[PDB]
Structure formats: structure tokens, C-alpha cells
PDB file of C-alpha atoms in Angstrom:
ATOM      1  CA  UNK B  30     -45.629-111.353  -3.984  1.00  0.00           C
ATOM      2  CA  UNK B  31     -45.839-108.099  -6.352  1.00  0.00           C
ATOM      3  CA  UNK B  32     -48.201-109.342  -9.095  1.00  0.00           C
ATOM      4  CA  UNK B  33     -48.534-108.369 -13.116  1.00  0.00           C
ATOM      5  CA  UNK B  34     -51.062-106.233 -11.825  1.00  0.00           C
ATOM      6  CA  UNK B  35     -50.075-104.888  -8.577  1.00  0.00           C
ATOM      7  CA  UNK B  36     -47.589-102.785 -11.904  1.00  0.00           C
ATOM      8  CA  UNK B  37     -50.618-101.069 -12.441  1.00  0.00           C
ATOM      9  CA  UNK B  38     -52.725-100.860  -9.046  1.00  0.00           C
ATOM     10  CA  UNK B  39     -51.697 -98.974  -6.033  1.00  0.00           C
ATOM     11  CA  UNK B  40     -49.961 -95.386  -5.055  1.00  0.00           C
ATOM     12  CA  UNK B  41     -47.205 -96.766  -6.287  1.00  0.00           C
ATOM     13  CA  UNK B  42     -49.458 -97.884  -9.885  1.00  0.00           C
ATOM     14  CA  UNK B  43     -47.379 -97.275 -13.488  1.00  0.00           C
ATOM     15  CA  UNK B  44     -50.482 -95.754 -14.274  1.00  0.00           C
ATOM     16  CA  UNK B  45     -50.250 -93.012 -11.243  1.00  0.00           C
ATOM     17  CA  UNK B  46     -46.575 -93.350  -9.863  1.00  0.00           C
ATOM     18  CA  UNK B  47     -44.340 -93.630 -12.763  1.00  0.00           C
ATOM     19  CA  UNK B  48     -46.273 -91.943 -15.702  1.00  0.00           C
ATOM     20  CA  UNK B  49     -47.467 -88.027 -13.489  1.00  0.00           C
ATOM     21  CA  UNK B  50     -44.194 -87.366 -11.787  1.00  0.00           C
ATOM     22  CA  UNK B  51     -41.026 -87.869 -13.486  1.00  0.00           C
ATOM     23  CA  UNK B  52     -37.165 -86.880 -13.550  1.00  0.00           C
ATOM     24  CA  UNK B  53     -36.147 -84.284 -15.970  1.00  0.00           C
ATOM     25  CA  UNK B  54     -32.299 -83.555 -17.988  1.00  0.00           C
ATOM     26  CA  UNK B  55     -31.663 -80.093 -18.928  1.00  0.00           C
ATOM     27  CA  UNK B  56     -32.854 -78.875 -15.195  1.00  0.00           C
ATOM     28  CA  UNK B  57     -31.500 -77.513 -11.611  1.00  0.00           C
ATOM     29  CA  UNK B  58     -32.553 -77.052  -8.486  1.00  0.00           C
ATOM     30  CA  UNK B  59     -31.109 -74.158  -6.015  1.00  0.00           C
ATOM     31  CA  UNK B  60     -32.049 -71.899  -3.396  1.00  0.00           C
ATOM     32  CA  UNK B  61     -33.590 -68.624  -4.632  1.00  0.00           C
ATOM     33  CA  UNK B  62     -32.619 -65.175  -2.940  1.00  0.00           C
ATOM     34  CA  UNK B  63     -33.944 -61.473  -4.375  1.00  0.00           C
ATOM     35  CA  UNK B  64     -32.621 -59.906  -7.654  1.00  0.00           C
ATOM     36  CA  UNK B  65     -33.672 -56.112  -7.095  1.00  0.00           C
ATOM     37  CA  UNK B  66     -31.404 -55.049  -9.754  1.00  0.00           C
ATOM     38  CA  UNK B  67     -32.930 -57.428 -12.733  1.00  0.00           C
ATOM     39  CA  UNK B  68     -35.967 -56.259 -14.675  1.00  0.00           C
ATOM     40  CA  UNK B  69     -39.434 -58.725 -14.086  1.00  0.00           C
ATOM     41  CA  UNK B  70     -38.245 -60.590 -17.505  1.00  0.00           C
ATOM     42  CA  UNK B  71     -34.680 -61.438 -16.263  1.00  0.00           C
ATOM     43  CA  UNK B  72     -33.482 -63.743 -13.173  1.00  0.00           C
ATOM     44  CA  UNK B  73     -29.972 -64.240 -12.048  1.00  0.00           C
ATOM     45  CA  UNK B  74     -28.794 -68.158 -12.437  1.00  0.00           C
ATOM     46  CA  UNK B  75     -26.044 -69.042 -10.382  1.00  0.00           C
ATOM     47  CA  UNK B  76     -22.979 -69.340 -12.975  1.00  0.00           C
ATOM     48  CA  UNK B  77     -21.307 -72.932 -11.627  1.00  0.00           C
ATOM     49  CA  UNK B  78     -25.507 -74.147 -12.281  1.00  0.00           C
ATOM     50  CA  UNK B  79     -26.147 -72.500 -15.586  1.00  0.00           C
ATOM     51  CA  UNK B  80     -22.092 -73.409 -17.290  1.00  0.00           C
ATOM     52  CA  UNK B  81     -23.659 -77.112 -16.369  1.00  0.00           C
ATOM     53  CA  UNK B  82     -27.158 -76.369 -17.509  1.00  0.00           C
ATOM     54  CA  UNK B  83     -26.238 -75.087 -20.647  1.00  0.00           C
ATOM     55  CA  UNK B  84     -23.393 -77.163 -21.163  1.00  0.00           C
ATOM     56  CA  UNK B  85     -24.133 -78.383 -25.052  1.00  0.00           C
ATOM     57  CA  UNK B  86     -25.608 -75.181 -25.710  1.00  0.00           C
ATOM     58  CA  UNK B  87     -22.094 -73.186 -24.782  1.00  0.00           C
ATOM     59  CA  UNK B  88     -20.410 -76.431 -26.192  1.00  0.00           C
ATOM     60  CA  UNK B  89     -21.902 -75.837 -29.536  1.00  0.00           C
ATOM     61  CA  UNK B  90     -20.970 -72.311 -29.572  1.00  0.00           C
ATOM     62  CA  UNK B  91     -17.243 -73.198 -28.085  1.00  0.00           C
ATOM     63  CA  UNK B  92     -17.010 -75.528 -31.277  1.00  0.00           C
ATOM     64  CA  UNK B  93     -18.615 -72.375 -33.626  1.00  0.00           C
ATOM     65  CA  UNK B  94     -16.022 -70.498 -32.307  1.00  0.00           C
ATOM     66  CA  UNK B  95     -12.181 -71.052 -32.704  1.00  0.00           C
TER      67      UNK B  95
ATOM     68  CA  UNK R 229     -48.917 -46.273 -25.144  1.00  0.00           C
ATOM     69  CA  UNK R 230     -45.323 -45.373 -24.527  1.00  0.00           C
ATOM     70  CA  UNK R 231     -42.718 -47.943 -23.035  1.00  0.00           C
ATOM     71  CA  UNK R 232     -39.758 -46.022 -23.801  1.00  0.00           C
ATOM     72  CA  UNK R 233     -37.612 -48.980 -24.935  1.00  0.00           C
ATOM     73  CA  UNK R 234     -38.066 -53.016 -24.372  1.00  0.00           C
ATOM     74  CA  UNK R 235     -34.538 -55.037 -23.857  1.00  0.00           C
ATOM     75  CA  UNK R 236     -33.820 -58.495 -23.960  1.00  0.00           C
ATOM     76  CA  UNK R 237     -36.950 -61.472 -24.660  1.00  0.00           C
ATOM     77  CA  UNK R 238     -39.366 -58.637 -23.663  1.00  0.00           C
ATOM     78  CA  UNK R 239     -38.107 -57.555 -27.540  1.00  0.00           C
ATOM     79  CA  UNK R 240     -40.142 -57.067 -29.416  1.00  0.00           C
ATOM     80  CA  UNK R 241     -43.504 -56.262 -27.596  1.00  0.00           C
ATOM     81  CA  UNK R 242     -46.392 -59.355 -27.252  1.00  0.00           C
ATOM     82  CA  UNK R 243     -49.260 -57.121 -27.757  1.00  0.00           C
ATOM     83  CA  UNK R 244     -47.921 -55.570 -30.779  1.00  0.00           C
ATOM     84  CA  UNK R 245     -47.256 -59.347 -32.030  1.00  0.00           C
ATOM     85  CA  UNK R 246     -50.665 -60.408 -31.004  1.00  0.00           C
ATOM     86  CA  UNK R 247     -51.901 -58.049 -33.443  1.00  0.00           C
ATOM     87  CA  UNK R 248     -50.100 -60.187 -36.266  1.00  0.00           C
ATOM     88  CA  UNK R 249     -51.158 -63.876 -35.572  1.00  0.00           C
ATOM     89  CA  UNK R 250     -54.925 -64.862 -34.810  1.00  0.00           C
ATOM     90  CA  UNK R 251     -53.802 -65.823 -31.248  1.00  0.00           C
ATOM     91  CA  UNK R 252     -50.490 -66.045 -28.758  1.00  0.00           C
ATOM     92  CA  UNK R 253     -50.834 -70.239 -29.410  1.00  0.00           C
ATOM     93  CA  UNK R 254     -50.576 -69.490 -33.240  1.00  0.00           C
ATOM     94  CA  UNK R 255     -47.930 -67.059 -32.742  1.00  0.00           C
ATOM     95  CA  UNK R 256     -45.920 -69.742 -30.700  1.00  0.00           C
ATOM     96  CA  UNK R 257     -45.694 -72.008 -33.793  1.00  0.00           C
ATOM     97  CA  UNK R 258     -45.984 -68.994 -36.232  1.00  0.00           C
ATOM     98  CA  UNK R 259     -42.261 -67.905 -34.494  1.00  0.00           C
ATOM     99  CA  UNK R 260     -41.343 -71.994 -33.647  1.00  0.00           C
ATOM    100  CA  UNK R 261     -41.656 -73.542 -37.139  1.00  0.00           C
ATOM    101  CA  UNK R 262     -40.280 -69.828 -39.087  1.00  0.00           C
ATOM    102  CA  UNK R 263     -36.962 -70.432 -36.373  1.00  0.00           C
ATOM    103  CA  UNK R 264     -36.965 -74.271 -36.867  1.00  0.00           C
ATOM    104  CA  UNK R 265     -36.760 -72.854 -40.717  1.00  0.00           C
ATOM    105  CA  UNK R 266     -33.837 -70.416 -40.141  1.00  0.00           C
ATOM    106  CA  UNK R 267     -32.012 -73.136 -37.907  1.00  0.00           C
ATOM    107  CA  UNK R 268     -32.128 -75.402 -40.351  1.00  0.00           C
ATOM    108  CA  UNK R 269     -30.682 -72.571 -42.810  1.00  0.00           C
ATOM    109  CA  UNK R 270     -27.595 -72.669 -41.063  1.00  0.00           C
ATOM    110  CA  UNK R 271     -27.555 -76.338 -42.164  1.00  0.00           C
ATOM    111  CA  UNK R 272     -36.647 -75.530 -46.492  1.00  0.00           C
ATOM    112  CA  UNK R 273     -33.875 -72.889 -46.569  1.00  0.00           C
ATOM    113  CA  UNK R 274     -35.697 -69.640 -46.574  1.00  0.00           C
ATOM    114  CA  UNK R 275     -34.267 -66.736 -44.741  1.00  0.00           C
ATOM    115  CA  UNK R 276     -33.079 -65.150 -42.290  1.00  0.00           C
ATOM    116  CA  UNK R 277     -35.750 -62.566 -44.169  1.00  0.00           C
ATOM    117  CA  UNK R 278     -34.692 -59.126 -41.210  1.00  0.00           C
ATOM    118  CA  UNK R 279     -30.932 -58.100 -41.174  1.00  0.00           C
ATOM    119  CA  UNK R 280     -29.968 -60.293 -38.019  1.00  0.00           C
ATOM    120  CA  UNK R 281     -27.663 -59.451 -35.237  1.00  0.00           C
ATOM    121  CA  UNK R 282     -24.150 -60.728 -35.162  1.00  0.00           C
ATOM    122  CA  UNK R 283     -24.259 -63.372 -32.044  1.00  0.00           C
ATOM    123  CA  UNK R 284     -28.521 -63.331 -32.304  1.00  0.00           C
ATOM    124  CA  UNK R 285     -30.837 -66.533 -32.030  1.00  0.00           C
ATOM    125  CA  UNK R 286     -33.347 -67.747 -34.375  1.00  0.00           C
ATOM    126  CA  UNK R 287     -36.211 -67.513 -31.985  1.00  0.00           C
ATOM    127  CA  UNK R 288     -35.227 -63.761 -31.983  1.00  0.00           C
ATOM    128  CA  UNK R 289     -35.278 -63.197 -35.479  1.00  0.00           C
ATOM    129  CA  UNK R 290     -38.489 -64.865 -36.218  1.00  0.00           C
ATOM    130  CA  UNK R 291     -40.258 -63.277 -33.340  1.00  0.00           C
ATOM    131  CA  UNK R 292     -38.643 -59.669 -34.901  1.00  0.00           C
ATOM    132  CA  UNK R 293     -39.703 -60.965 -38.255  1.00  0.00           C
ATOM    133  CA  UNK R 294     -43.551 -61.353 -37.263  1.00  0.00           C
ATOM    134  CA  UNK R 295     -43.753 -58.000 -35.501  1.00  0.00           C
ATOM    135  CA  UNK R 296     -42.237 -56.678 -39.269  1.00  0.00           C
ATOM    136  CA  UNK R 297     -44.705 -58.632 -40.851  1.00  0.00           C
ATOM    137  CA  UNK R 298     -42.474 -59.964 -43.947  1.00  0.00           C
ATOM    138  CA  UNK R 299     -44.467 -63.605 -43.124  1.00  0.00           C
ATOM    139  CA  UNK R 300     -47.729 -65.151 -43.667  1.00  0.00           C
ATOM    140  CA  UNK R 301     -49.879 -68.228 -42.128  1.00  0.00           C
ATOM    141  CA  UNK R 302     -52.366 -70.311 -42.987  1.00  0.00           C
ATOM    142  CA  UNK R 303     -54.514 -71.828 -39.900  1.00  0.00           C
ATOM    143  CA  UNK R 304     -55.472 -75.680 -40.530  1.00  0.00           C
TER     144      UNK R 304
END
């Protein structure tokens, strides 16, 4: 049986597992290709990713404008 | 030192900013706190101080603002 602290001991510790590597909103994954035409600065975001990824962000801006 | 024109984030230039605040992690919050000030603006109400662009950001305008140097900091 998992004990109160077998939470907290282990690989699979709250102190190790589930406190260093998390899952994060406001982030995508993809596969990356070259951008030879964009400047060091600027990378190209796939626009079906980035409408979702900035969804509130164009939202708010959709409800600024008319 | 010529770079003919910057465009985009890379506006204005970092070592022309680094100038202004003691160091790049001052100038974070230097720009942060001034844009957290002209977001809430929109809505301390001071600003924008630079004649902003018509669609621009506040991140933008503070980080313009600096390089002008219409503001001042005080390091705790």
C-alpha cells in the first residue's frame, strides 16, 4: 500500500515528480522546419497554432475592435 | 557603430538601453512596471510619456521611452 510518505519518497516523490516538471497553458508544441526569409529576432508560428495560442490576446483586441 | 535600421522587438537597440539602467535585470522591471503603468492607463495613471503608435503595445512604448530617457529609477 502507497503510504503518507511514499507522497514524498521515490522517482515518483511530490517533492521530485510533481513540483520540477509540470504542464503549462498558454503553450504549443510542433515540428520546426527552416525560416531563411525571417531575420534572427523573428520565427514563423504556424497560424491554426498561434490563432489558438493567442486566443484571449486576439479576443481582447476582437472585443477593442467593432 | 552603424546598423542601418532595427525592425520589430530588436527596436530599439539593447546596448543603447543598457546604457540607461544599471543592468539588463533592472531594465526588465525598469520597462515591466513603466508598461504595467501605461496598461493600467488604459484602465497610477501616468503616461503614455513618447507619442505612441496607433495599434503599438505597452512593452514597446516603455522600452522606446527608456532609450529617450523621459524616466527615472531608484534601485532598492
Amino acid at each position: 500500500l502507497k503510504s503518507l510518505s511514499d507522497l514524498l519518497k521515490g522517482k515518483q516523490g511530490r517533492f521530485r515528480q510533481n513540483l520540477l516538471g509540470k504542464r503549462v497553458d498558454y503553450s504549443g508544441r510542433s515540428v520546426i522546419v527552416v525560416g531563411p526569409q525571417l531575420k534572427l529576432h523573428q520565427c514563423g508560428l504556424p497560424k491554426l497554432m498561434a490563432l489558438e495560442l493567442f486566443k484571449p490576446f486576439v479576443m481582447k483586441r476582437l472585443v477593442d475592435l467593432n | 557603430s552603424a546598423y542601418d535600421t532595427p525592425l520589430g522587438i530588436t527596436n530599439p537597440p539593447i546596448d543603447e538601453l543598457l546604457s540607461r539602467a544599471s543592468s539588463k535585470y533592472a531594465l526588465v522591471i525598469y520597462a515591466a512596471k513603466r508598461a504595467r503603468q501605461i496598461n493600467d492607463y488604459y484602465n497610477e495613471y501616468v503616461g503614455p510619456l513618447v507619442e505612441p503608435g496607433l495599434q503599438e503595445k505597452p512593452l514597446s512604448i516603455a522600452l522606446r521611452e527608456i532609450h529617450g530617457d523621459l524616466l527615472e529609477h531608484t534601485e532598492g
